[PDB]
Amino acid sequence: VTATDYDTFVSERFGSIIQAVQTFTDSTKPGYAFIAAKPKSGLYLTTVQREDIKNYLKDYNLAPITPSIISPNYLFIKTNLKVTYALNKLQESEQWLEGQIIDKIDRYYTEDVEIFNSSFAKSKMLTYVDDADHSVIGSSATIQMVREVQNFYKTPEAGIKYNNQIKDRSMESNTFSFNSGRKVVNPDTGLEEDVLYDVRIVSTDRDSKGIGKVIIGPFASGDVTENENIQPYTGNDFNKLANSDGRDKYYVIGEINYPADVIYWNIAKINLTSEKFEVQTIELYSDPTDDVIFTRDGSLIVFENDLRPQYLTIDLEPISQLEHHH
Amino acid sequence: ATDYDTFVSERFGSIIQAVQTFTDSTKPGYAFIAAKPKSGLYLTTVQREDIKNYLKDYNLAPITPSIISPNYLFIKTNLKVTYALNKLQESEQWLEGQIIDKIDRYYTEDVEIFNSSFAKSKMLTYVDDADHSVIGSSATIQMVREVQNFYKTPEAGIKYNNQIKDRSMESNTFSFNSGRKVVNPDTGLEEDVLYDVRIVSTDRDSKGIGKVIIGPFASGDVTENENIQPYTGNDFNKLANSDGRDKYYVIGEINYPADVIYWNIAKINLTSEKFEVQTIELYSDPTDDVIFTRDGSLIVFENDLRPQYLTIDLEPISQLEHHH
């Protein structure tokens, strides 16, 4: 028993295609012993869905509790890097240089951060970035935590957490398409099926107890049917998106507990069927109050640029030389 | 630069830590040498007359190089370091000391030098480096140019050698003296009412230009004739009041892209006499986190003597539902 004993158990019987193990138990889900497992190479163990994992299921000794071999709950860092260097000090291209900083940003992660109950610090990685040339003068960054959400429709039973604290309104997802039942025409073309607009999930400033709503919109006046319950969110209090289509009526569908660090929603709370949504997986961005981001239970801060390039933009800036004369 | 600076840097290496020459495009004919005491900030007028009197040593009859103290750019740093409770042995008061040293060691080595530059990203890695227990830091900077005369910018202008943001330029506050009597038996029979005032900049125009406007007044004590009339824009930062004061006026102007700042209080009929200061400090947010020096400007951390330009917030961590 004991998660620690189990972590080993697997750092042996598998200690081949596995880099790390976190055996934690969830207080919401009794009798279930959860086993986080980093593939040591990629991201998901049997993304093929357990052709390998299921194998770990197939390891049994004692107890009335049952294993649930999962892939680690990944925290991502959407970094907007802005390194600046000296035109002259540089001998190879900006292209070769990028491939030089991300070689470092990786060295940091995989040595200090990509570990269980281990953490990430922006200041500490920007030291690694700075440390890629004779110049390279300095560097800026703007990060957000990312949680990848399977089934956009609704969060888990027990909500999703970051293992970190975010700021008011900080929480927002990427946009996805909502197929309004309605139909419209332009450019000599026809019905064009059903009108679609870009819609998304955002949080609101916390109330006097640490608790804002999780709202979704915009909409039409519209494509969502209003009840005694279902009513457009009452007031400004968050981040609205570009109505290049003019729209705006958002609806409440959950809440963030900022202090408790839990976020729940369920689109079924209004009456939209997942059919009315193109997507399956979405991204949930928030920006921390943390100058240090903590991983934790089954959570793991990882940097996989190749397979997750989207989570890193590098904007370089070249600089004129100074005094060359003496 | 070094052609004559170096020498000097030999006969005086025991004081001066930074020497460079330059001309002023404009003050044609004049060559100045900025020098920073290793021992602080401003060389003393005796230290300065000695050093000037080696100019005779090396024979030159023409008026020959003015020695002078460097044009300092200061970084008002608002630092935040979060550290691990377990791994920190001594006092918080100690830790600060330990890092406020690191900052200086970075400044002395990589920054306090002519045309070398300050990189917030670097000094933070110095901060990180100060203890084995300093998990991670963050930081917010401002630029401080310390103005010799508040009343009017130099003939030419004042510049940061760096890009600031909109409304960003703002001096501190200085007492303006209206001229009215207060009639208060508390302190006799007459105090001469004097309310604070500052000089801020407004938003870039179509074309890159802002207006350098000057803090709140009470209608009467500034005379307006058509031309010189209250500024109206709300495109700047107004200040905390307790008084009925909301009349700001326009002098000079900021050329944001060419960073030049000229103003002249005279543009409103207010003699120096009217203000009880002679020196001020101009702040402003950089655009970037890498800031630069140029002709005779020097960036410097002199913290036991400019302590007002650093503040440290620590955040002790354990494990852990919370660090703000």
Side-chain angles (χ1 to χ4, degrees), chain B residues 299-316:
Chain B
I299 282 157
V300 68
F301 181 73
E302 276 281 350
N303 191 103
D304 40 14
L305 180 176
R306 182 61 60 180
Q308 21 168 172
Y309 295 156
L310 212 214
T311 92
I312 302 194
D313 312 331
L314 289 74
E315 195 176 355

Side-chain angles (χ1 to χ4, degrees), chain A residues 246-265:
Chain A
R247 321 136 295 152
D248 138 39
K249 262 193 167 171
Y250 303 93
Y251 294 103
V252 180
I253 61 157
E255 46 184 47
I256 359 83
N257 203 170
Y258 284 108
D261 174 34
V262 300
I263 328 177
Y264 183 85
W265 78 80

Side-chain angles (χ1 to χ4, degrees), chain A residues 14-246:
Chain A
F14 296 89
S16 117
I17 80 264
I18 271 183
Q19 187 176 4
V21 214
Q22 256 303 257
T23 290
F24 60 94
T25 150
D26 187 55
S27 46
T28 273
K29 306 191 160 200
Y32 277 125
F34 297 110
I35 339 286
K38 175 162 169 63
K40 173 181 301 185
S41 310
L43 284 187
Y44 302 105
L45 274 201
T46 290
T47 179
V48 293
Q49 341 103 18
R50 294 161 260 172
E51 231 200 45
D52 184 1
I53 75 179
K54 168 178 168 57
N55 255 28
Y56 314 102
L57 255 303
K58 298 174 185 179
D59 279 66
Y60 290 115
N61 310 60
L62 143 188
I65 76 197
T66 134
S68 187
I69 298 72
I70 45 83
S71 284
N73 195 355
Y74 292 104
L75 231 221
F76 286 97
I77 324 272
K78 221 275 180 164
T79 317
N80 292 353
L81 203 46
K82 326 263 175 50
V83 175
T84 107
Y85 64 99
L87 267 168
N88 43 103
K89 302 278 196 58
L90 218 198
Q91 317 300 39
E92 255 78 7
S93 184
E94 285 189 358
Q95 162 101 344
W96 163 91
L97 174 158
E98 300 189 6
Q100 210 66 16
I101 78 166
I102 141 172
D103 278 340
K104 288 287 191 185
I105 291 183
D106 192 73
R107 210 260 213 173
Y108 166 57
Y109 263 93
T110 73
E111 284 200 353
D112 313 346
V113 166
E114 293 194 3
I115 277 148
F116 280 124
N117 295 328
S118 179
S119 66
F120 166 106
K122 178 218 284 193
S123 86
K124 221 156 197 86
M125 106 172 154
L126 284 191
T127 99
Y128 279 75
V129 154
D130 283 4
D131 176 16
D133 213 32
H134 192 93
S135 141
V136 202
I137 302 174
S139 75
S140 306
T142 296
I143 75 176
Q144 277 172 312
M145 297 175 300
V146 200
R147 221 93 231 237
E148 275 152 9
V149 170
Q150 26 263 43
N151 198 45
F152 74 108
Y153 193 64
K154 73 154 301 180
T155 67
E157 24 274 335
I160 91 182
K161 26 163 40 67
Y162 284 92
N163 303 8
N164 297 263
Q165 208 88 358
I166 75 192
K167 312 184 148 210
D168 276 5
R169 303 174 187 194
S170 155
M171 192 214 73
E172 66 184 47
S173 66
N174 66 343
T175 44
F176 44 72
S177 277
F178 163 62
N179 168 40
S180 83
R182 301 170 316 176
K183 48 285 142 292
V184 75
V185 190
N186 220 347
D188 190 296
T189 92
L191 265 206
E192 279 278 323
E193 316 41 86
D194 10 28
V195 186
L196 317 196
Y197 34 38
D198 271 1
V199 107
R200 71 163 181 188
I201 299 162
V202 156
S203 52
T204 79
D205 296 328
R206 70 196 68 204
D207 79 323
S208 18
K209 182 203 166 207
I211 285 199
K213 309 300 174 201
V214 172
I215 61 183
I216 183 178
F219 289 89
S221 322
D223 272 310
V224 154
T225 37
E226 306 170 13
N227 280 333
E228 171 174 17
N229 293 315
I230 300 164
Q231 292 281 308
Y233 181 36
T234 37
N236 196 359
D237 188 22
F238 60 107
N239 295 344
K240 323 181 161 203
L241 64 38
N243 64 344
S244 38
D245 288 294

Side-chain angles (χ1 to χ4, degrees), chain B residues 41-322:
Chain B
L41 270 159
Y42 316 112
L43 279 180
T44 180
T45 157
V46 46
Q47 276 172 326
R48 294 182 183 174
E49 290 188 327
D50 304 337
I51 175 57
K52 198 172 216 145
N53 289 151
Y54 293 93
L55 294 174
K56 291 179 179 179
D57 218 24
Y58 197 84
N59 43 9
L60 197 52
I63 54 278
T64 81
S66 348
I67 72 69
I68 73 58
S69 291
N71 190 44
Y72 294 105
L73 213 228
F74 289 103
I75 314 292
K76 233 260 250 279
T77 309
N78 241 77
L79 181 70
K80 285 152 186 76
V81 186
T82 103
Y83 70 108
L85 266 170
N86 351 138
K87 314 311 163 89
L88 199 253
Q89 308 290 30
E90 279 84 355
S91 185
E92 263 190 12
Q93 170 76 345
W94 176 78
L95 211 260
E96 284 187 350
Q98 209 60 26
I99 71 192
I100 170 155
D101 277 342
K102 280 298 190 161
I103 290 181
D104 190 66
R105 212 269 211 160
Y106 162 63
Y107 264 86
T108 38
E109 278 189 298
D110 302 7
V111 180
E112 306 203 3
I113 286 178
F114 284 86
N115 311 306
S116 216
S117 47
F118 177 86
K120 173 217 285 192
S121 29
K122 229 153 190 183
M123 87 141 176
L124 286 172
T125 110
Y126 267 77
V127 180
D128 280 9
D129 192 13
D131 197 77
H132 274 96
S133 144
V134 177
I135 265 165
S137 63
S138 65
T140 261
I141 69 187
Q142 254 188 313
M143 284 186 309
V144 203
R145 218 88 224 213
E146 282 172 332
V147 179
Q148 299 260 49
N149 176 61
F150 75 102
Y151 194 84
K152 47 160 284 80
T153 38
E155 33 309 329
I158 149 65
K159 56 163 43 213
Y160 281 109
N161 302 320
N162 269 280
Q163 216 59 45
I164 77 180
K165 309 185 181 197
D166 254 15
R167 300 137 147 265
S168 172
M169 191 218 60
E170 63 169 30
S171 77
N172 71 76
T173 45
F174 43 79
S175 326
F176 162 70
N177 192 3
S178 55
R180 322 141 162 159
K181 101 281 179 182
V182 71
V183 173
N184 58 351
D186 302 50
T187 174
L189 303 135
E190 281 202 358
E191 274 294 329
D192 221 331
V193 160
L194 21 58
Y195 51 72
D196 276 14
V197 145
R198 61 183 196 155
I199 69 211
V200 196
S201 93
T202 73
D203 287 316
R204 299 161 195 253
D205 77 355
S206 16
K207 100 188 219 318
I209 296 282
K211 294 276 195 172
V212 173
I213 91 170
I214 183 174
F217 292 98
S219 191
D221 42 35
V222 199
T223 66
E224 307 139 25
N225 4 263
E226 156 247 2
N227 63 336
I228 275 184
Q229 256 82 69
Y231 177 87
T232 167
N234 271 217
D235 55 340
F236 59 84
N237 305 293
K238 308 205 173 188
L239 55 27
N241 249 26
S242 303
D243 300 297
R245 302 190 280 113
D246 83 341
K247 323 209 174 191
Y248 302 66
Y249 293 67
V250 193
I251 49 194
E253 61 185 18
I254 329 80
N255 191 121
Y256 280 90
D259 80 320
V260 261
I261 316 190
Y262 180 97
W263 78 72
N264 186 318
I265 304 305
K267 293 179 180 176
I268 60 179
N269 304 324
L270 284 185
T271 22
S272 263
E273 291 71 281
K274 295 271 196 169
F275 311 84
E276 317 209 326
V277 294
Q278 222 282 332
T279 188
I280 71 176
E281 301 140 355
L282 211 50
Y283 306 92
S284 46
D285 290 66
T287 288
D288 310 331
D289 282 356
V290 181
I291 89 145
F292 304 97
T293 48
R294 216 185 184 168
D295 273 336
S297 306
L298 190 72
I299 282 157
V300 68
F301 181 73
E302 276 281 350
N303 191 103
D304 40 14
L305 180 176
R306 182 61 60 180
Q308 21 168 172
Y309 295 156
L310 212 214
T311 92
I312 302 194
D313 312 331
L314 289 74
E315 195 176 355
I317 279 15
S318 224
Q319 295 103 28
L320 155 300
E321 186 222 82
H322 223 295

